[PDB]
Design a protein around this ligand. Sequence first.
Ligand SMILES: CC(/C=C/C(=O)NO)=C\[C@@H](C)C(=O)c1ccc(N(C)C)cc1
Ligand SMILES: [Cl-]
Ligand SMILES: [Cl-]
Ligand SMILES: [Cl-]
Ligand SMILES: [K+]
Ligand SMILES: [K+]
Ligand SMILES: [Mg+2]
Ligand SMILES: [Zn+2]
Length: 360
Amino acid sequence: NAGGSSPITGLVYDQRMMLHHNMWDSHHPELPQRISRIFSRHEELRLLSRCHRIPARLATEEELALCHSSKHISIIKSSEHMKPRDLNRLGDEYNSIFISNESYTCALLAAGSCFNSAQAILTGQVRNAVAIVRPPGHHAEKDTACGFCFFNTAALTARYAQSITRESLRVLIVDWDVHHGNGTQHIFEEDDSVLYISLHRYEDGAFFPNSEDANYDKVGLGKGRGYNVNIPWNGGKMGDPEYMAAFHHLVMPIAREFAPELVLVSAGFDAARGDPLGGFQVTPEGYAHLTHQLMSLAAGRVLIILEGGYNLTSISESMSMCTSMLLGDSPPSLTPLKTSATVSINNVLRAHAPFWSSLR
Ligand SMILES: CC(/C=C/C(=O)NO)=C\[C@@H](C)C(=O)c1ccc(N(C)C)cc1
Ligand SMILES: [Cl-]
Ligand SMILES: [Cl-]
Ligand SMILES: [Cl-]
Ligand SMILES: [K+]
Ligand SMILES: [K+]
Ligand SMILES: [Mg+2]
Ligand SMILES: [Zn+2]
């Protein structure tokens, strides 16, 4: 359907990112095959040849310092040279981390791939893009790794984008991974130039990463007050109706009022139907509709960054549907909310109405 003036979608994927692995447990859910399966599905669905292929690169240590401490950079960098006993001991210093000799390099490639993709978008080489990267990023804090994440790819990309345009570039990060992006929240908690909106299974703080920082009443600090939006789910499985309602009532009104100039999606697919770690029911068509809504922001400048997601079929179908939307395909055809989901949405509305006229 696309013709000479149709917008272009970028895609980054590099099999080097498969080298990070759990050397003790080949069945750990954060598998190398996550990215190769998503990439394969893009070939099967004839999406790859429709995209402009963006190369990966490594992030530099100076770029990592946009968000991370010198200590954290140094320690993770040192893991490249460690023997298994030390890799095991180092990983045990963090919550839910495994490390191999290739982990640091893979984390650098995930970040650099997203920097290249943001650069392609912001220079107009492509309109939007998809980054099929691992390890994930959103639990990584300034000073520590966490939850399968070493460096905060999305947060770094936001800063990188500002560094190659202007400091005030308004970046929206929408984090639809089923888990709260604690690191992204904290990195930007005092920042009004980066709006963080997370939807996540919360369960009154019982669900990983197990902190009440993920609740709706954490709205940001100082100049960042209002610029941190947590949409926490309690009461078990949520799906398309709840996510569509959260987008309709919260994500899209706040985002439109913020008027981002770049949208980054921390696109985990662990809220997907079939995911045994998330336990939720978002369908591929649901993810397509979320993507299509975000495309209406920022003059279409959207970068979808893989985070979590552990059912290989589910993530492959879901991320492919997102790319299909970015490419301009028609959204697929797509109910009362769970009672607790209405409660959650109304709690966020109460918390953020003081800051966002679109909600009053
Ligand atoms: C860290 C995490 C999710 C991160 C994510 O997706 N962050 O966005 C999930 C942990 C709690 C988990 O559920 C788990 C389950 C099985 C397992 N093995 C079978 C080895 C190891 C860990
Ligand atoms: Cl193809
Ligand atoms: Cl050893
Ligand atoms: Cl390399
Ligand atoms: K999230
Ligand atoms: K913020
Ligand atoms: Mg600033
Ligand atoms: Zn997750």
